[PDB]
Scaffold this active site. Structure first.
Site, PDB file in Angstrom:
ATOM      1  N   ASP A 160       0.838  -1.201   0.000  1.00  0.00           N
ATOM      2  CA  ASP A 160       0.000   0.000   0.000  1.00  0.00           C
ATOM      3  C   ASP A 160       0.887   1.271   0.000  1.00  0.00           C
ATOM      4  O   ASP A 160       1.472   1.607   1.007  1.00  0.00           O
ATOM      5  CB  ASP A 160      -0.918  -0.057   1.204  1.00  0.00           C
ATOM      6  CG  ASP A 160      -1.966   1.047   1.149  1.00  0.00           C
ATOM      7  OD1 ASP A 160      -1.783   2.019   0.380  1.00  0.00           O
ATOM      8  OD2 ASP A 160      -3.042   0.983   1.780  1.00  0.00           O
ATOM      9  N   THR A 161       1.262   1.784  -1.172  1.00  0.00           N
ATOM     10  CA  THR A 161       2.136   2.960  -1.271  1.00  0.00           C
ATOM     11  C   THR A 161       1.452   4.216  -0.740  1.00  0.00           C
ATOM     12  O   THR A 161       2.126   5.153  -0.393  1.00  0.00           O
ATOM     13  CB  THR A 161       2.629   3.225  -2.666  1.00  0.00           C
ATOM     14  OG1 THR A 161       1.552   3.292  -3.625  1.00  0.00           O
ATOM     15  CG2 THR A 161       3.422   2.024  -3.151  1.00  0.00           C
ATOM     16  N   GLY A 162       0.137   4.184  -0.624  1.00  0.00           N
ATOM     17  CA  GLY A 162      -0.655   5.168   0.079  1.00  0.00           C
ATOM     18  C   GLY A 162      -0.566   5.249   1.610  1.00  0.00           C
ATOM     19  O   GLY A 162      -1.085   6.221   2.197  1.00  0.00           O
TER      20      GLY A 162
END
Lengths: 99, 99
Positions: free
Chosen positions: A25-27
């Protein structure tokens, strides 16, 4: 591994001796795991995303093996609908976005 | 471009003639944008993440230029704390994770 995005980027992790699936999850600044049993001391904490906030427990310096490369870092545990491996650990396994 | 994750993977987008910054979010199935003015018809809709849910308007087939590669697809607009480019569009610009 290179991992395309046509489905959820779910990977297998081992943490606290248990195996789980989790979402790269780069968020997510940090890593948040469902209700699970983990060692060490911990401070309480609240995190937010879309929809609002949850209360979580925060453990520092936890080993985690994410697709078979190991990372140590902070892990939050709490009532998240999905396990998420955040940037705090993705950086340690060398994870990059490319387009 | 290859983009490492030591900071938030924020990029510049153009959409509806406006420019915004948004977060490449492999944890997001769809793209959600703050309160903004957009053309076409739309169905209302609710989405969730961590913290819970928001109500959003959904527009289909919107052009978007994300770091200068163009993508067309669904875009939700609503009270999100951050603009997020979700997998629905990342796949169209060729975006992969590599470690």
């Amino acid at each position: 591994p290179q991992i395309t995005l046509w489905q959820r980027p779910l990977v297998t992790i081992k943490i606290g001796g248990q195996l789980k699936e989790a979402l790269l999850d780069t968020g997510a600044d940090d890593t948040v795991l469902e209700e699970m049993s983990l060692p060490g001391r911990w401070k309480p904490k609240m995190i937010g995303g879309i929809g609002g906030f949850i209360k979580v427990r925060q453990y520092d310096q936890i080993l985690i093996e994410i697709c078979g490369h190991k990372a140590i870092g902070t892990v939050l545990v709490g009532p998240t609908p999905v396990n998420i491996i955040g940037r705090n650990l993705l950086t340690q396994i060398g994870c990059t976005l490319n387009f």
